[PDB]
Design a protein around this ligand. Structure first.
Ligand SMILES: [Cl-]
Ligand SMILES: [Mn+2]
Ligand SMILES: [Mn+2]
Ligand SMILES: [Mn+2]
Ligand SMILES: [Mn+2]
Ligand SMILES: [Mn+2]
Ligand SMILES: [Mn+2]
Length: 276
DNA sequence: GCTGATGCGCCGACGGATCC
DNA sequence: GGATCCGTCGGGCGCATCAGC
């Protein structure tokens, strides 16, 4: 069935107005995405912070259009050293972060271009492009090891300031999170191993799935559709993109949106509203 | 400099069998 | 014998490299 994201809630449970809008988008090739007007959509959305995944773009190749964003003028980019045209993440922000870092512990030697950490006054933001398990699950074991390493890294961040983790976490946590759960249990994104990893992430750090917290029983809400077989027009998709929050931030949570109508990638944007 | 072929990475449709 | 299961097949898009000119 088709899906209509409900209206933006912009006030928290206790009545405080949203003061921070974060948008996250796997753009599936930043240069292509810009040619397909993705930045026009971004300007309409006017987030305070924009997190981008799968930029497939080294920083020297960034289109000039990215220089003409006065409201997102603090920009941080990461791409892998030996696999350019794959991976790549970006974080663009209205206000300057206090600290910025890359990777999950040894980026200087493992230059992977998958994770950016930005510390702000009230919280730490992490954006991630989690490694896909691969066609035929050929890189599932690597993914499991990476999940463990990530969980440990994040636990030693959340012990300081509250954490917001966003991005493409490359798993549909539960059956409600994709259209075809039965046929996909041996597929990247819905293996028991990946689903369990997501569960351990929520429990160990700990974190809450913002969208599912607000909409625990809402089906057909996805953020990815394969380019093939007209899947998006049929809303045959997967929810792979998330905002995960420290429990101490739940009173700040106003809404967690899925921007289903925004084209330019095989993922759609997701947007978080917080009252800080 | 430029194009297009190839390589690499990253699952839903459907035909046949099974359930009762 | 309609619904469900399950395993096989055929397939959109972006970006890198390369041959050719
Ligand atoms: Cl940078
Ligand atoms: Mn709306
Ligand atoms: Mn992609
Ligand atoms: Mn399958
Ligand atoms: Mn040349
Ligand atoms: Mn070409
Ligand atoms: Mn059929």
């Amino acid at each position: 069935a088709l899906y209509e994201d409900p209206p933006d809630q912009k006030t928290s449970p206790s009545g405080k107005p949203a003061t921070l809008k974060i948008c996250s988008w796997n753009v599936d090739g930043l240069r292509a995405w810009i040619k397909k007007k993705g930045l026009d959509w971004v300007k309409e959305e006017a987030p305070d912070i924009l997190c981008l995944q799968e930029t497939k773009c080294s920083e020297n190749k960034l289109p000039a259009e990215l220089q003409e964003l006065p409201g997102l003028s603090h920009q941080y980019w990461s791409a892998p050293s030996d696999k350019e045209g794959y991976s790549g993440v970006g974080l663009l922000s209205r206000q300057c972060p206090l600290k910025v870092s890359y990777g999950i512990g040894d980026e200087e030697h493992d230059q992977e271009g998958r994770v950016i950490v930005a510390e702000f006054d009230s919280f730490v933001l992490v954006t991630a492009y989690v490694p896909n398990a691969g066609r035929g699950l050929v890189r599932l074991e690597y993914r499991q090891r990476w999940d463990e390493a990530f969980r440990k890294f994040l636990k030693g961040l959340a012990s300081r300031k509250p954490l917001v983790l966003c991005g493409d976490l490359n798993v549909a946590h539960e059956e409600i999170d994709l259209r075809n759960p039965k046929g996909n249990k041996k597929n990247a994104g819905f293996t028991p191993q990946e689903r369990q990893g997501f569960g351990e992430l929520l429990q160990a750090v700990p974190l809450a799935d913002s969208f599912r917290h607000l909409y625990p029983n809402t089906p057909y809400a996805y953020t990815f559709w394969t380019y093939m077989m007209n899947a998006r027009s049929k809303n045959v998709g997967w929810r792979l993109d998330y905002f995960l929050l420290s429990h101490s931030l739940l009173p700040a949570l106003c809404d967690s949106k899925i921007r289903s109508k925004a084209l330019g990638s095989d993922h759609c944007p997701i947007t978080l509203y917080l009252a800080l």
